[PDB]
Subunit: 239 residues, 3 copies
Amino acid sequence: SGLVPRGSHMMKLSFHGQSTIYLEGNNKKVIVDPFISNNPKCDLNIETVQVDYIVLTHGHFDHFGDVVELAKKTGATVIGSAEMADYLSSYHGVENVHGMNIGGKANFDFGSVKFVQAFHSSSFTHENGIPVYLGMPMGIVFEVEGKTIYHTGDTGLFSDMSLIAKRHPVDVCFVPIGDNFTMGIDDASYAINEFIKPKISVPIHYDTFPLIEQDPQQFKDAVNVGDVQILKPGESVQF
Amino acid sequence: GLVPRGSHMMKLSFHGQSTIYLEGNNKKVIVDPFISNNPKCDLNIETVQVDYIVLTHGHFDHFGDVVELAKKTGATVIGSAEMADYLSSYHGVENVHGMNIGGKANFDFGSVKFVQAFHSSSFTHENGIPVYLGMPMGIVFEVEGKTIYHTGDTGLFSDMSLIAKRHPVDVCFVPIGDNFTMGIDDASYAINEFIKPKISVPIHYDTFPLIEQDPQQFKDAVNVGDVQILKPGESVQF
Amino acid sequence: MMKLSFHGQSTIYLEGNNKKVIVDPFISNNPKCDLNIETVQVDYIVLTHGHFDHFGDVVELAKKTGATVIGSAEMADYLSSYHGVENVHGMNIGGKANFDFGSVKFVQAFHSSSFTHENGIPVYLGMPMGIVFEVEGKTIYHTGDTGLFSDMSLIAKRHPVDVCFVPIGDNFTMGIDDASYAINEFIKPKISVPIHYDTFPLIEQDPQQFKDAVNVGDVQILKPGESVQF
Ligand SMILES: Nc1ncnc2c1ncn2[C@@H]1O[C@@H]2COP(=O)(O)O[C@H]2[C@H]1O
Ligand SMILES: Nc1ncnc2c1ncn2[C@@H]1O[C@@H]2COP(=O)(O)O[C@H]2[C@H]1O
Ligand SMILES: Nc1ncnc2c1ncn2[C@@H]1O[C@@H]2COP(=O)(O)O[C@H]2[C@H]1O
Ligand SMILES: [Cl-]
Ligand SMILES: [Zn+2]
Ligand SMILES: [Zn+2]
Ligand SMILES: [Zn+2]
Ligand SMILES: [Zn+2]
Ligand SMILES: [Zn+2]
Ligand SMILES: [Zn+2]
């Protein structure tokens, strides 16, 4: 316990399938949208994953994923909408939640989390077929170890992507390309070129299901600003 | 062995509230089928033929007869992921296709792209507890070379210009009823400043006393394209 | 002088043509609220959204005063059918209605809207909203609980604003930086009042940092019970 915490390195930021990202800030571990056990393309394993924090963009099954079991096993704090925190706390018995809402910023030991708007939906559907409403869907702006990371969440194209990116210039943007349920290739590449203009773009939310199969090279070819890193599950952003 | 019917003026009609009907590649599509409980609606649940039902949002005056119409016709119901789950799991609808805002899907009639809207989306059970059915939406269709923008139930928003610049619009269906949506002034502003379609059709008025409007005031206020004030049963003229 | 007062969190009160209006009546459960449920007089209750800290004492206040509750379709249906409130008027975003007090127009917001029943299952109550009032020749924009959005400029350009009530608490809404940007860049009202801070430890802020950051019009840091000075 007398050992000094591990010193600085290249910021750790990895993609794990669908909308799942993992990052470390000040030796704390953060995961977004942990769809691990039910995504066969996800390289993570809920028995071995180490996390201090879980952040949810919205409540759909392919983002909510293993949050309850993961939080209960790790003691991780779950960060989400006010509705998401009350649902996790009062319906699922998750002990450590932090409710926020759009535009809200919070400072944690790992860095900062700010929720931003998205155009999508947010619910988890129960056995009777009734969606449970879990707030407006959101994107995330992280400030971690000097890096600004914008995870758009599941979203359609919107011009305030430019307002988010102007007010919070972006090192890394994770942007969905799968179409049907989100932007496709054309809208995502327009989002990056016209509005966000990050240093690095990573396409997300494709191939997990047949309906959202896409060739991410068509995204790369359409992006004219910064660098595109087409990450396979398990791969880290190179800064 | 007969070849399917060949090409004609694109078939596109208005049926009261926000109900529109269109044909693409000999497939029949209805939006927001509020038929049996809208006495101003010219259609009849027992006779209307549809291959697809598209829902902009869950409110009773749009959801309407979707369950009984889908059951009779075998039509595919296209809507939000929440609307697809609810219809399929709670109501037993056989054929659903879930989507979400910004998603585009290709069907045998043409394409459906859902876009954003500012409103609400639920269906209220008897006990006063809404069933959440996603964010409200508009629709961009591409059918037989025509781009149709149905704005859904919505307030005015500047990204109407983004939608229209990215998908230049042949016909825009825009609500004018006020109280629950844009009224005359906001809808005409939407058309003049943001959407700039070839043809505008005002919708979502007169169905209930609270949303009675003179659509001529909308026509008078619009300075771009053509305005066609359609009565229930009337077709857009191209 | 038009009567317009702040009462803690996002609660405002105004009078138009002798009719009394309250927004987001979080009275009994806000120890900083100067009002008392048993003695507030109102003809109208307007709700930006369903959260406990806005919904507040709406059912009790409505049942006691006979006030008409103005909100989203979903809020009017829930209050009427679930809570048995006698007098509701359902509206939705972009809609305007004319009352004897003046007009109410709901506008967009970025937040959430529900009231949580037992077991952490929310009752959906629509999209969250702001309000544009026109009352005794004054345009009042209550942004509701919201994040920053550029259509704040569209709302303000189409409805030039005398008074803007804008949240600064952060975590659940805009903080100081985003609110002052909203006022300076988008809304540019005659008078800005910060709201939705200090009620709970998480949303404690110094409203003086908001006043210092605002370069347009006049900032009035109202304490609960104080009136806007025209
Ligand atoms: N609750 C759920 N749990 C697991 N898989 C689901 C659930 N809901 C939908 N899916 C699947 O997830 C897929 C995503 O979109 P598809 O249309 O490809 O088909 C969907 C279903 O097969
Ligand atoms: N769930 C519902 N089912 C049937 N009619 C409804 C429902 N909700 C509202 N209405 C009626 O539809 C009308 C819409 O406009 P009004 O608010 O004037 O009055 C409303 C009611 O008369
Ligand atoms: N439904 C509720 N009823 C009463 N208090 C609540 C409710 N929801 C949240 N709170 C409290 O309100 C506080 C708002 O700020 P905090 O997030 O710090 O902590 C929150 C809770 O302690
Ligand atoms: Cl915008
Ligand atoms: Zn989703
Ligand atoms: Zn998703
Ligand atoms: Zn509606
Ligand atoms: Zn409607
Ligand atoms: Zn709130
Ligand atoms: Zn609040």
